[PDB]
């Protein structure tokens with residue numbers, strides 16, 4: 001469980017080690033994903049000093065017949081198999097309609113190269129969800145050692161209604177306005193051939209491993225306590241369902257999950273998701289990631 005520093009991304013480093021994907025939203029959201037040149041001119045991406053900002057447009061009222069709300073989706077140039085990824089996150093997007101994620105995938109053969117969500121939710125609904133999506137023959141035992149709570153235990157996208165196999169973080173400050181109020185915190189994900197684990201440490205935690213908080217060149221996950229989410233290989237050959245994955249950090253709106261009326265409305269958001277996102281730009285002034293660092297160890 002000992003790893004050594006492979007990549008250390010801070011501020012402007014993200015501009016040369018990740019790309020912006022100006023792509024049609026694969027989850028069909030009310031979003032216009034812009035390229036890196038456009039992101040920078042329009043200040044949707046700001047990457048300077050010890051800060052990366054990734055945000056949505058919070059000034060434009062959308063044309064109902066035009067493209068969605070301007071936002072960004074960044075993807076690491078490098079891919080990883082057995083590794084630990086540590087995200088020091090000060091702020092994540094909030095707002096009705098928002099659907100932010102920090103995750104890993106191989107887009108080129110989805111779902112067969114797998115996907116793991118480290119940070120994800122919709123419509124400001126805490127807590128955080130940590131979820132795997134795979135092809136066939138991957139499930140999770142009903143009970144295993146973690147602080148979080150499992151919801152769906154079948155990871156196979158074709159037989160699970162695309163929910164994946166997920167775990168809910170135990171605290172509200174894992175996600176959303178609550179996370180943001182607390183100054184964020186740290187997410188760490190360890191992936192091996194045998195398992196995937198995610199740990200969350202709130203910004204104010206008295207027990208955050210120095211490994212995680214200070215980012216030295218050597219880490220040891222044995223010292224990190226029980227994971228928030230645990231995906232063992234009891235009923236899933238982990239290595240055979242995941243290949244080399246890029247890291248992706250993005251913000252979409254509405255679409256296949258967040259945009260469902262029951263979900264959007266069930267979260268206390270008014271009206272329809274698309275109309276809300278069209279007509280309330282100032283409601284997304286806080287729809288930003290503020291990232292202090294992402295580090296990868298191998």
Ligand SMILES: *[C@@H]1O[C@H](CO)[C@@H](O[C@@H]2O[C@H](CO)[C@@H](O[C@@H]3O[C@H](CO[C@H]4O[C@H](CO[C@H]5O[C@H](CO)[C@@H](O)[C@H](O)[C@@H]5O[C@H]5O[C@H](CO)[C@@H](O)[C@H](O)[C@@H]5O)[C@@H](O)[C@H](O[C@H]5O[C@H](CO)[C@@H](O)[C@H](O)[C@@H]5O)[C@@H]4O)[C@@H](O)[C@H](O)[C@@H]3O)[C@H](O)[C@H]2NC(C)=O)[C@H](O)[C@H]1NC(C)=O
Nearest residue numbers: 011042043044045046047048049050051052053090290292
């Ligand atoms: C495009 O978009 C960008 C990004 O949004 C816009 O940039 C912002 O521009 C505005 C207006 O010019 C700036 O607002 C001003 O900020 C002034 C103070 O700035 C300084 O402090 C900021 C806060 O720092 C503290 O908090 C952070 C955690 O979030 C810590 O890292 C840091 O150590 C500080 O902690 C102290 O305080 C806390 C308690 O609050 C304690 O607990 C700690 O112990 C510390 O005592 C900080 O965000 C700024 O950092 C920026 O600049 C430095 C270099 O100077 C760089 O290294 C960083 O990477 C970062 O870029 C800075 O240190 C304030 O005086 C003034 O009144 C006003 O509010 C704002 O700083 C910008 N935000 C940035 C840069 O992130 C940009 O304007 C926009 N372009 C457009 C529209 O054209």
Ligand SMILES: OC[C@H]1O[C@@H](O[C@@H]2[C@@H](O)[C@H](O[C@@H]3[C@@H](O)[C@H](O[C@@H]4[C@@H](O)[C@H](O[C@@H]5[C@@H](O)[C@H](O[C@@H]6[C@@H](O)[C@H](O[C@@H]7[C@@H](O)[C@@H](O)O[C@H](CO)[C@H]7O)O[C@H](CO)[C@H]6O)O[C@H](CO)[C@H]5O)O[C@H](CO)[C@H]4O)O[C@H](CO)[C@H]3O)O[C@H](CO)[C@H]2O)[C@H](O)[C@@H](O)[C@@H]1O
Nearest residue numbers: 026027101103107110115117131133161162163164256257
């Ligand atoms: O539980 C947490 C979990 O929730 C998931 O949302 C679920 C909803 O998807 C589900 O709604 C059903 C509709 O999806 C369905 O509409 C069909 C379309 O989905 C389909 O398009 C497919 C594409 O979406 C797919 O593209 C891939 C993306 O899905 C993938 O998305 C990422 C996720 O994998 C995730 O983990 O993280 C990130 C960040 O948040 C997501 O971006 O990304 C990859 C790589 O880029 C894409 O390839 O590609 C396939 C082809 O391979 C397409 O089929 O299109 C068909 C038309 O043919 C539609 O039928 O309709 C149903 C009925 O209306 C609807 O129920 O609902 C449940 C709620 O019960 C949600 O749980 C999130 O997607 C997931 O992110 C999250 O972890």
